[PDB]
Ligand binder design. Structure first.
Ligand SMILES: CC(=O)c1[nH]c2ccc(F)cc2c1-c1cn(CC2CCN(CCNS(=O)(=O)c3ccc(-c4c(O)cccc4F)cc3)CC2)nn1
Ligand SMILES: [Cl-]
Length: 331
């Protein structure tokens, strides 16, 4: 036969219970403003699907970010917009403030609240163990919210987390890969960034769920606390899985494959090999020990599992002892 079906352990039917217009983004009609309200100041970054500019709203002098979309499928634009609107006001979700089209070229852009991330290379290399716990909690607040709202982010990774440390402000950004979760729907595995792709995506298991975001969360925590960017440094999609096999081991991988009756690409035959599951200690050394603790390693081990159904949910994660101290201060 073919694969064994899978359903998310939490928020399973959340979208079944909502009215249709909530998730049927194909039919959302969009209302465009004039980009001429917004004047671009400088460029902030590029990417596969967009360029991002700092801009000024000339009607109220407010500073904003304009995200000019490169040509995506028309329905992916509706999708991102509908997701952003559904999540607007949620904890640590970037707030969408406008939808405009260039008046001549007719290119669409989204307008967001500005997050000030400048002097971030300092931030990277100087977050305390406490700050990492803090910002992990902030990320998790964003993921529990969007998962509870029936939405898979699918592209969690440091570049899609914006932090303004001066104001301990974190926003989860770029929802253009996000999808609504529906039980039984088979999704596109060609999502996320290579180093953050979950095993489900690498073996072509299409019926995945919110747990994917938590595998990605796992790869950021590991690469933060070990100081190894990226943690799983694969050289293509196939070899990405080998690199995970070299840490998680092959026994658990092949048990996962068997559990879900996954057809494994015959390419993986020769390369996956035979690998023992490593202890997290072999990634510790004097330069990163200050960020590694028993709690951090228990927490991380519970995110990086082959079987998506067995990874910690966002909510379960926020309850881990790792965050005991963060939870206390918030109060
Ligand atoms: C791209 C895009 O659609 C976009 N759309 C927007 C909408 C509104 C807006 F205003 C801006 C944009 C942008 C947007 C994108 N950019 C450029 C990048 C430059 C690289 N940094 C990554 C470092 N992050 S960061 O907070 O230091 C960071 C991240 C994570 C951690 C971390 C970790 O990796 C692991 C554990 C704990 C952690 F905290 C640390 C720092 C992010 C911004 N600027 N604006
Ligand atoms: Cl964005």
């Amino acid at each position: 036969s073919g694969p064994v079906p899978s359903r998310a352990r939490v928020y399973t039917d959340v979208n079944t219970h909502r009215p249709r217009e909530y998730w049927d983004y194909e039919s959302h009609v969009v209302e465009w403003g004039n980009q001429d309200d917004y004047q671009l100041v400088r460029k902030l970054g590029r990417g596969k699907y967009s360029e991002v500019f700092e801009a000024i709203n000339i009607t109220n002098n407010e500073k904003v970010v304009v995200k000019i979309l490169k040509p995506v499928k028309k329905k992916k634009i509706k999708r991102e917009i509908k997701i952003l609107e559904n999540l607007r006001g949620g904890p640590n979700i970037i707030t969408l403030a406008d939808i405009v089209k260039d008046p001549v070229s007719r290119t669409p852009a989204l307008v967001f609240e500005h997050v000030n991330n400048t002097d971030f290379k300092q931030l990277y290399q100087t977050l305390t163990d406490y700050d990492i716990r803090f910002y992990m909690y902030e990320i998790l607040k964003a993921l529990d919210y969007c998962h509870s709202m029936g939405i898979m982010h699918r592209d969690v990774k440091p570049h899609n987390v914006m932090i303004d440390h001066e104001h301990r402000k974190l926003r989860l950004i770029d929802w253009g890969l996000a999808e609504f979760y529906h039980p039984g729907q088979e999704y596109n595995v060609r999502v996320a960034s290579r180093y953050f792709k979950g095993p489900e995506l690498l073996v072509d298991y299409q019926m995945y769920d919110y747990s994917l975001d938590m595998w990605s969360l796992g790869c950021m925590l590991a690469s933060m606390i070990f100081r190894k960017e990226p943690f799983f440094h694969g050289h293509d999609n196939y070899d990405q899985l080998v690199r995970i096999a070299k840490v998680l081991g092959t026994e658990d991988l092949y048990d996962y494959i068997d559990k879900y009756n996954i057809e494994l690409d015959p390419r993986f035959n020769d390369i996956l090999g035979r690998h023992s599951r490593k202890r997290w200690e072999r990634f510790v050394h004097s330069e990163n020990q200050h960020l590694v603790s028993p709690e951090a390693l228990d927490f991380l081990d519970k995110l990086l599992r082959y079987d998506h159904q067995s990874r910690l949910t966002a909510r379960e994660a926020m309850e881990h002892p790792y965050f005991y101290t963060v939870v206390k201060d918030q109060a």
